[PDB]
Amino acid sequence: APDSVDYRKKGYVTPVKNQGQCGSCWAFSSVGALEGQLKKKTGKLLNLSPQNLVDCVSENDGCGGGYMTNAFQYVQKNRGIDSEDAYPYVGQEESCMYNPTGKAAKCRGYREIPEGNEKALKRAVARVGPVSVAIDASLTSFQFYSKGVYYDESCNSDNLNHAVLAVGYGIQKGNKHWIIKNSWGENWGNKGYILMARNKNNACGIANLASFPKM
């Protein structure tokens, strides 16, 4: 695998979104991983619909939370996911209103990264593209991030509570990092992104619940 990778440079990453009050981070994370595979497969980048996932993944809990693997399994079983423009985000769970005419991507399954293994996460990001990951994002230090490679000794790898998207990895001032796209809008963090410590004892649980879709 290369020493550094940044899929934003390859045009695999759509603009940062803002989930608002709804606990739909898992849907934004899943959509971002699908967007990356869609760009890799077809050469064209398009925003996909987290609302379609919120409303239609019955194995998840909508705005109450969910898993990315369940979202990928739904897209595969459903034979598609709608674009964002065809099924816009409204910030609350509704009945499933998927419309196949708005289909903009398909999924052929998924893979999970071995639990806790940041080297395997790195190899997946290098081989595949952006990977969905879960972290402890509860600390106010995480929430107030602005610059640098984030590390807080108090982060708890056993307390996963948010889902984000690893769009690359690298190093800055000698500190290995993951490049993370959040879904708290561009006013959060560094234009909506955070660099998180890599190989620092699986800081914030970054490699505990990682997965990516097949296309």
Ligand X SMILES: N=CCNC(=O)C1(NC(=O)c2ccc(N)c(F)c2)CCCCC1
Sole binder of ligand X in the list 50, 66, 129, 189 (CB under 6 A): 66
Using the contact rule CB under 6 A, the part of the chain among 41-49, 56-64, 108-116, 170-178 near ligand X is 56-64
Using the contact rule CB under 6 A, the part of the chain among 31-39, 62-70, 103-111, 116-124 near ligand X is 62-70
Q: Which residue has the tokens 């409303």?
A: 55
The residue annotated as part of the active site, out of 60, 78, 182, 208, is: 182
Radius of gyration of the chain (CA): 16
Name the token pair of 207: 């490699």
For this structure, is 199 an active site residue? no
Q: Is 65 in the site for ligand X (CB under 6 A)?
A: yes
Strand runs (DSSP E) across 87-126, as ranges?
Answer: 103-105, 109-112
Kindly tell me which of 25 and 81 has the beta carbon lying closer to ligand X. 25
- Of 74, 55, 6, 33, which is closest to residue 210 (Cα–Cα)? 33
Binders in 68-97 for ligand X, by CB under 6 A:
none
Give the phi and the psi of residue 18 in degrees, each rounded to 5: -135, 110
Q: Is 209 in the site for ligand X (CB under 6 A)?
A: yes
Q: C-beta of 45: minimal distance to ligand X in Å?
A: 23
For this structure, is 175 an active site residue? no
Site string for ligand X, 95-134 (x = CB under 6 A): ---------------------------------------x
Q: Is 206 in the site for ligand X (CB under 6 A)?
A: no
SS3 156: coil
- Of 22, 37, 15, which is closest to residue 84 (Cα–Cα)? 15
Q: Is 70 exposed, middle or buried (0-12, 13-18, 19+ CB in 10 A)?
A: middle
Sole binder of ligand X in the list 39, 122, 162, 177 (CB under 6 A): 162
Binders in 13-32 for ligand X, by CB under 6 A:
23-26
Asked if residues 65 and 23 have their Cβ atoms less than 8 Å apart, the reply is yes
For this structure, is 177 an active site residue? no
- Of 87, 94, 91, which is closest to residue 57 (Cα–Cα)? 94
Q: List residues near ligand X by CB under 6 A.
A: 23-26, 60-61, 64-67, 134, 160-163, 209
Active site residues: 25, 162, 182
